[PDB]
From a paper:
The Microrchidia (MORC) family of chromatin-remodelling ATPases is pivotal in forming higher-order chromatin structures that suppress transcription. All MORCs share three features: an N-terminal gyrase, heat shock protein 90, histidine kinase and MutL (GHKL) [name] domain, a central CW-type zinc finger (CW) domain, and a divergent C-terminal domain (CTD) with predicted coiled coils (CCs). [name] possesses multiple DNA-binding sites that undergo structural rearrangement upon DNA binding. Importantly, [name] mediates chromatin remodelling via ATP hydrolysis-dependent DNA compaction in vitro, regulated by the phosphorylation state of its CTD.
As a [name] neuropathic mutant S87L was shown to have residual ATP hydrolysis activity, we have identified and utilised ATP hydrolysis mutant [name]. The AMP-PNP density was visible in the cryoEM map and at the same location as found in the crystal structures. The presence of AMP-PNP density near the ATP lid in MORC2S87A model, confirmed that this mutant can bind but not hydrolyse ATP, mimicking S87L variant where some residual [name] activity is still detected. [name] mutant had similar DNA binding affinity as wild-type [name], indicating that ATP binding did not affect [name] DNA binding. The dimerised [name] domain is well-resolved in all the cryoEM maps, but no density is seen for CTD to model in the full-length MORC2PD, MORC2PD-DNA and MORC2S87A maps. The lag time for DNA compaction by MORC2S87A was 3.5 times longer than that of MORC2WT, with an eightfold increase in compaction time. We found that MORC2WT compacted DNA into a large DNA cluster, whereas MORC2S87A, MORC2N39A, MORC21-603 and MORC2604-1032 variants did not.
Numbering used by the authors:
A (entry chain B): 4 to 87, 94 to 307, 339 to 510, 519 to 551
B (entry chain A): 4 to 87, 95 to 307, 339 to 510, 521 to 551
Write the structure that this text describes.
């Protein structure tokens, strides 16, 4: 029947702040926007600051990527909280969750073939007009000749006047400047302004102490990881396979696959029952809706609905033939021994980092300096609201216990206890007895550390990860000294890791 | 001007699951419903499991309280995401928690001459393909049980939707849940079609302990009881519990955790963050108040300006209050291994067993010390799940201040002079291990018993009485000064402490 007269769960002003409160990690709030840029299939995100002293915080936070962009339908689907194979976005709210943690308002400029769209979700408009609902101006211009593209001219006029009133771009030419800030035919520019302040009135994002970095505006104690104080260090290891370049203030971050930056990286295949059970659970949930859709078609659109969903059922049963094991990669961190811990990636995105499991939890000299990296998929684990924890805490703890057992196995097979922990760390540049000090940066110790680590670097245009046989600049495969991968059309040489057997 | 034709941000079906994903702590998801019942000024919540084999999980999860209840207006404001000395300020927590526990939830509330059902069912949206979040909202008169609505076809659709997807398939089956509220005002929240684990069992274990709601897992010896037992979690969920928590009809022995500690000393820490956030709160609310009075100078703007100056006059009285943070530190002697900081935000527990200061270092000193702070809402705000804090920098500043106050407390309590291993072993901890419980021998049990005063709560007046030595009344208090329910409530006389 018709439910037009029934009550609907609506949105209010304060729920933007409520959605903002999930991020105790403001770098996680940034990380959700760069996640959306990765979901755009972008080759490059520029995360730069535009100095605007008239706004709160003194500057805007602009997120410019060259991705697929958005049509008016997808742009209208942003403010629909929630959505309808390797993408990060599954919750449909994380842009709104992050941008309100970062700043009071955010304005989104995007472009996709001949339609380019502005999304101006403004909390300052809601304060200054006292409107309880979440009213979002969404005007669309033609991407070539710039006429308004809408079915409601007075609605377009109201939206654009609202943008020129509360946006940092008070004119249509200043809007067009942000629209041609996107260089390609498609892309998205997300500008977050009126940033959150501390008690002293300074913005939380420190962009002044390091001009090539977005920093946490606080002091740095001894035991604080650089990923929680530096967004450069966070975005370097934010992805388990970073194909898209990230530019902070126009400077590319040296991203790294954490498995290749480890001494003796051994790979472990852990057959997870959580992998197998929910892979078997998703095939009956998909077959249940396929049965009711088939009898619904048993007119043309209902038949086509079941026909294009029948191939979805063939895809998930094909995935059952793939073995349900998890890739446990363990390697010793020699460049920083103290920056060890477990780096849990969920569908190639860092959720939990620097986690101590197994004998790392025990207070003791051994099993320290090991970095464990895993890419769990979405059917094994789902992220939390902030994508900094895991929703299934019980099987997350099961994963941590299994990874502790695999850590103990990795520690006993590489035989550091047989060869000596103390002299092993002494010969690798670590002379002081303190754990948290960086190693000695002399020439022989630096060459000893860099001899074990293969130098991996990413090209600028083909975006492939090359290896060099003994704030980065722009790098192409042409100046690779290795003649096997001296061209951009060469196949990307995958990381080769020794295999370890656990029990 | 008018913005009726302008686009609005909407809610979709999958946002209920997205909102549900904020609760890594399922006991936090339960605790949000307990928080809403505390905001109801309920004297008693009832947490009970109604066994229903036709639903997922095998049983219903019921949240019955005798609070203020809801009228149709604030019952409709429940599904308005984001609303409002109350814990609830995010307008979200019931919707996040109930969808963390179960696929659907049906809410029965009653207030004054009216009573209202709130059905929000993800089963209805799944079986009907509904993209939006459609909530049936019928309202009955609390005496005559007639439909109180201006749209009888909408009422018929809402009620038939409840009878189709709710566990209560008839009007009489709905009415049984409506008279399950005993008083004139109250709220019954039913969570059904609960989330299963990998083995198909529900996540909430109600079978191993029939008086408790537990995590359905094998618990190692390092697990805190509040992370695996909802009875132990709701015992310390509030810093001043006037609620009577009832789990499966059994009253939870709640406690203010400060008085259950050996030698508790109080530290009044002057927080500059408390002073600074109060100093911007005074300048912000009058700015809203002065522009509300200008526009009201048409009757709706005066009502907005009257409640704005009510807030504006309230905070000016609170600025002259001493902007200090009350740090309470005590030694946990019934369980040495269950130590750590218990940070309460607006009298609601957020962080449990936080090791700060010398507890961070793996070592023998400052072990067994439990710190308790009632952080106001002016200092910090909770996260989406209310299991962390939004301001991580100021939370870490608070933790460092609590660490240095822990060091001050440790040098104050003179365990630095009376021996470290001679103090713990005479208190029942003969073993060299850390995580084992103390000795159950009678002289050690009585030695631990006489230090902590027995602070237990009456059932009618809800006051906390101390015994000098079940369902308990102030009449069988052996103390002659507090043998009646009309007696003045006696606070804990915890001595003050000074730093440096
Ligand atoms: N910069 C961008 N480029 C392309 N698409 C974008 C961009 N930002 C947002 N989107 C799209 O906008 C929609 C809504 O954004 P949002 O980030 O809230 O959703 P989501 O990525 O699906 O969610 P989440 O990350 O919480 O799972 C998504 O479909 C997302 O793909
Ligand atoms: N058992 C209850 N008794 C009385 N009022 C209730 C009850 N449960 C919910 N409510 C009301 O429901 C409204 C919205 O519910 P919700 O719990 O999401 O809001 P909130 O408590 O303000 O939010 P939060 O706790 O996340 O800050 C609140 O204003 C609250 O008063
Ligand atoms: Mg997203
Ligand atoms: Mg593009
Ligand atoms: Mg709430
Ligand atoms: Zn190349
Ligand atoms: Zn009494």
């Amino acid at each position: 029947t018709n439910y037009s007269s029934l009550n609907r769960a609506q949105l209010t002003f304060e729920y933007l702040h409520t959605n903002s409160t999930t991020h105790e990690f403001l770098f996680g709030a940034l990380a959700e926007l760069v996640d959306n840029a990765r979901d755009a299939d972008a080759t490059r995100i520029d995360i730069y600051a535009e100095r605007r002293e008239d706004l709160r915080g003194g500057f805007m936070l602009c997120f410019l990527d060259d991705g697929a962009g958005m049509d008016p339908s997808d742009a209208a689907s942003v403010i629909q909280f929630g959505k309808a194979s390797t993408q990060i976005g599954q919750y449909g709210n994380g842009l709104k969750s992050g941008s309100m943690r970062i700043g009071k308002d955010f304005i989104l400029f995007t472009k996709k073939e001949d339609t380019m769209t502005c999304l101006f979700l403004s909390r300052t408009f809601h304060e200054e007009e006292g409107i309880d609902e979440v009213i979002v101006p969404l005007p669309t211009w033609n991407a070539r000749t710039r006429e308004p593209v809408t079915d409601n001219v007075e609605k377009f006029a109201i939206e654009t006047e609202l943008i020129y009133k509360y946006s940092p771009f008070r004119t249509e030419e200043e809007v067009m400047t942000q629209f041609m800030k996107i260089p390609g035919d498609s892309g998205t520019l997300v500008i977050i302004f009126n940033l959150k302040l501390m008690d002293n009135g300074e913005p939380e994002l420190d962009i002044i102490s390091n001009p090539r970095d977005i920093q946490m505006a606080e002091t740095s104690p001894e035991g604080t990881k650089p990923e929680r104080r530096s967004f450069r260090a966070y975005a370097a290891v934010l992805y388990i396979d970073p194909r898209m370049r990230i530019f902070i203030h126009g400077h590319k971050v040296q991203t790294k696959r954490l498995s290749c930056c480890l001494y003796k990286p051994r790979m472990y295949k852990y057959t997870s029952s959580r992998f197998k059970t929910r892979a078997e659970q998703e095939v009956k949930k998909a077959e249940h809706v396929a049965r009711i859709a088939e009898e619904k078609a048993r007119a043309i659109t209902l038949r086509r609905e079941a026909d294009v969903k029948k191939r979805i059922k063939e895809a998930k049963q094909r995935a059952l033939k793939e073995p349900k094991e998890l890739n446990f990669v363990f390697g010793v961190n020699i460049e920083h021994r103290d920056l060890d811990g477990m780096f849990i990636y969920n569908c190639s995105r860092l959720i939990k980092m620097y986690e101590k499991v197994g004998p790392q939890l025990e207070g003791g000299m051994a099993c320290g300096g090991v970095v464990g990296v895993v890419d769990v998929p979405y059917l094994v684990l789902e992220p939390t609201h902030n994508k900094q924890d895991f929703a299934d805490a019980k099987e997350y703890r099961h994963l941590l216990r299994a990874m502790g057992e695999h850590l103990a196995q990795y520690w006993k097979d590489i035989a550091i206890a047989q060869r000596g922990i103390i002299k092993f760390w002494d010969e690798f540049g670590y002379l002081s007895a303190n754990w948290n000090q960086p190693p000695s940066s002399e020439l022989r110790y630096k060459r000893r550390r860099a001899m074990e680590i293969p130098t991996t670097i990413q090209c600028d245009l083909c975006l492939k990860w090359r290896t060099l046989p003994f704030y980065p600049d722009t790098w192409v495969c042409s100046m690779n000294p290795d003649p096997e991968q001296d061209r951009c059309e060469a196949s990307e040489q995958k990381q080769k890791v020794p295999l370890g057997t656990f029990r």
